[PDB]
């Protein structure tokens, strides 16, 4: 059954995280320039603690989300994506458990403070929603979820909900790791729904949220076709130089990388100040 | 069928598409393809196919094409200039016309701007022709944006109803819609002509040592050519080497 359960945000630095394979083309030993929705380098990522007092807010999805969490407790189980998050519209529910992952798109009437019971209707129903009907999509596969860091990227383009993921070890406590690791495509779901908001589902809890932007990156593929490094071409003048020269190493010298231009502040129109109208109707409605 | 201002769209994917049954039919009055030959469709593969459908009158069928103007092209259903697809139409006088007039089919007559390609506008906002605000009230310089055809069985051909289906071929990614072409045995270590999901070329195929990831289907060179593919049936990775 549904039960009832704001704090200021914390921020951390995302040094070189949130990079993923932009397409399904194999490349190796090459530097490839691409334009896609990526998490900007050294951006401010919001650091949440859902269970501190319970505060697990609904967040905007915008144009795509970078999501990450570190834990061994397996508290984060899934996510909700949709608009009104009630029985009025279709909503996407992604929930993991011990053996599998279940993904449904239905008219869910979600709890005010939705979650998964640690011990249990259904394992994906009791604490999450009061009812569900008019299901249009169902998918079942294997689970999506020292210290274990799990990174995800969520995109929703042309009806396809695209999930990327990577699982790595970590020895940090209060931040995200440095170094480079690209996220691989996990699943492409042909759902066809609109997503404006999302929420994290916990089992009864720290996680990071960043947002993707239309950015140009230079990606380095090694001999095994693995992306090992990248340059954010709009980060700084040096990165711009690296992208311009298509190289991760720049020798001493002076390079022309771009051009500058002053943009117009306003628009002005200056026409003759005549007020008489052209006698077109006299042509169109002539008797003969 | 839908009205042209509120046209229907259906997505087609993950299937075998036989286009010859449509093209070789005697029942269609119009069958025009753009960006592709109608006789090569069965040899191609696409990522998605869209099927749009609606009713217009005979004289307006010419507006369903790239680079056209008119009330239908501008305010109801717009195609892109780089359109790839086929426009199919037939006379439906026997189904859509009624004695006394069929007023179910409607089109947009007034709009403040032209539609973008594949844009759909189903609003009924009163159109302001003058400088004075209408505030939702119809009258002088304030028009209702839609109008009916009123199809009748005794109308001239240009005023008879036509049912139109537009097939738009989306080519990007893995293909999901392919023509009914039969596959052959895989041949390696010899110079062959190959066709992998619509990807054609000539070369020698050998076992690859390239560590493709599960989602990757082919590799590319700096010349934008394919130098490795995943076989669509065995999921084996093959290298492509040009014939000596």
């Amino acid at each position, epitope marked *: 059954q549904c039960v009832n359960l704001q704090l200021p945000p914390a921020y951390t630095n995302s040094f070189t995280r949130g990079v993923y394979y932009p397409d399904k083309v194999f490349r190796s030993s090459v530097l490839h320039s691409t334009q896609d929705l990526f998490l900007p380098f050294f951006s401010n990522v919001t650091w949440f603690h859902a269970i501190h007092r319970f505060d697990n807010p609904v967040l905007p999805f915008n144009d795509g989300v970078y999501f990450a969490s570190t834990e061994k407790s397996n508290i984060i189980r899934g996510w909700i994506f949709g608009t009104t998050l009630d029985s009025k519209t279709q909503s996407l529910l992604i929930v993991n458990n011990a053996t599998n992952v279940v993904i449904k798109v239905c008219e869910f009437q979600f709890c005010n403070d939705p979650f998964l019971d640690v011990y249990y209707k259904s394992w994906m129903e009791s604490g999450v929603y009061s009812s569900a009907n008019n299901c249009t999509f169902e998918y079942v596969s294997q689970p999506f979820l020292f210290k274990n860091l799990r990174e995800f990227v969520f995109k929703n383009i042309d009806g396809y909900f695209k999930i990327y993921s990577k699982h790595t070890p970590i020895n940090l406590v209060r931040d995200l790791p440095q170094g480079f690791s690209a996220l691989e495509p996990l699943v492409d779901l042909p759902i066809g729904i609109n997503i404006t908001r999302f929420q994290t589902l916990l089992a009864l809890a720290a996680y990071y949220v960043g947002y993707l932007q239309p950015r140009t990156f230079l990606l380095k593929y090694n001999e095994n076709g693995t992306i090992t490094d990248a340059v954010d071409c709009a980060l700084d003048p040096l990165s711009e130089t690296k992208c311009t020269l298509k190289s991760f190493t720049v020798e001493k010298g002076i390079y022309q990388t771009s051009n500058f231009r002053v943009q117009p502040t306003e628009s002005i129109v200056r026409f003759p100040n005549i007020t008489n109208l052209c006698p077109f109707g006299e042509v169109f409605n002539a008797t003969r | 069928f839908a009205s042209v201002y509120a046209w229907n769209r259906k997505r087609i994917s993950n299937c075998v598409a036989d286009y010859s049954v449509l093209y070789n039919s005697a029942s269609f009055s119009t069958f025009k393809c753009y960006g592709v030959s109608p006789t090569k469709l069965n040899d191609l593969c696409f990522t998605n196919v869209y099927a749009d459908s609606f009713v217009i009158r005979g004289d307006e069928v010419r507006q369903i094409a790239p680079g056209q103007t008119g009330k239908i092209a501008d305010y109801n259903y717009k195609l892109p200039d780089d359109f790839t697809g086929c426009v199919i139409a037939w006379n439906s006088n026997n189904l859509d016309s009624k004695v*006394g007039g069929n007023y179910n089919y409607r089109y947009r007559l007034f709009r403040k701007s032209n539609l973008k390609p594949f844009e759909r506008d189903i609003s009924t906002e009163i159109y302001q022709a003058g400088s004075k605000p209408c505030n939702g009230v119809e009258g002088f310089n304030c028009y209702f944006p839609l109008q009916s055809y009123g199809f009748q069985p005794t109308n001239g051909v240009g005023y008879q109803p036509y049912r139109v289906v537009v097939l738009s071929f989306e080519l990007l990614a893995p293909a999901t819609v392919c023509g009914p072409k039969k596959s052959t045995n895989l041949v390696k270590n010899k110079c062959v002509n190959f066709n992998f999901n619509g990807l054609t070329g000539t070369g020698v195929l050998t076992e690859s040592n390239k560590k493709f990831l599960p989602f990757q289907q082919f590799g590319r060179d700096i010349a934008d050519t394919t130098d490795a593919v995943r076989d669509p049936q065995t999921l084996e990775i093959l290298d492509i080497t040009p014939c000596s």
Partner: antibody
Amino acid sequence: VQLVQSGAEVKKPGASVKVSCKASGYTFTGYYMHWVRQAPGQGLEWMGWINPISSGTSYAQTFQGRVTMTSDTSITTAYMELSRLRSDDTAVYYCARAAPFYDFWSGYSYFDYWGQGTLVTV
Amino acid sequence: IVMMQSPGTLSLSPGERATLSCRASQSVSSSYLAWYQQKPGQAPRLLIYGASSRATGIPDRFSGSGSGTDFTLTISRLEPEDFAVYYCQQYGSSAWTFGQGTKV
């Protein structure tokens, strides 16, 4: 183009009357339908119009709150209903066709086709 | 606006010419002035629209002219069927107004 109206009606004060007009020979939704009243020995008075495509109407101030106009495109027929009838509503009621306001050559300013009227006595 | 026709009654022989006048209390666009002919026991029919344009099916024995506040309807040679009541009609301010009519 033809316009055919219902037959004469006799009502008592406080009652209501509905007069129909069936159209043929043209695209019904392409034109406005107007109603015009002619009391015995009197001239012509405009009551209002309906636009079948939108079901939008406009009424002369005289009849505002008393007259309602409707239409049904499936039978290309227009209706006019006048409530709170009085003895001074005795008149021959006509339906007439005119162009919509978007007509370039001002075909909306006049009535090009008339039906035979319906005599209503109160 | 007020539309006033004159004379209230006109009397003349068949084969003779008749002229009817209509005056407006205010200026009226020529495009908004029309004339109708109503025979005894019949609905009105359009004769002239746009001040001067004949309606479809109307003989060239009928013509109209005028501008501003003064409009006329002319019948070149009257037939036995032309001895009816004529009306002028004006459009403006989202309303349609008729004159009192004149009998020929």
